[PDB]
Design a protein around this ligand. Structure first.
Ligand SMILES: [Cl-]
Ligand code: NA
Length: 101
């Protein structure tokens, strides 16, 4: 074995998520953070090329989490689903864990 997830960063600023992800080599390297502009909501930040893309983690009426259409009982399941289904509607981007310092 039991290990904490390498992708949960708590309340880091959106800008610091961009700073850290920019240094990752591989597209799809990502983190979940707790949004500062919408407290109580999560955001998913993902390196793609020279960019860092940000996704709102949306909630349904029952508290399930989703990005687009498919929803899950946990952030953990949302993240894992998107290791093999693209997070993006404009590119094929699959979540992969950050390298690690
Ligand atoms: Cl896909
Ligand atoms: Na999807």
């Amino acid at each position: 074995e039991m290990k904490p997830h390498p992708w949960f960063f708590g309340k880091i600023p959106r800008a610091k998520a961009e700073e850290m992800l920019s240094k990752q080599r591989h597209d799809g390297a990502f983190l979940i953070r707790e949004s500062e502009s919408a407290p109580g909501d999560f955001s998913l930040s993902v390196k793609f090329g020279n960019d860092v893309q940000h996704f709102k983690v949306l909630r349904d009426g029952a508290g399930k989490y989703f990005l687009w259409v498919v929803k899950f009982n946990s952030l953990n399941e949302l993240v894992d689903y998107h290791r093999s289904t693209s997070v993006s509607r404009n590119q094929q981007i699959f979540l992969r864990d950050i390298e690690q310092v």
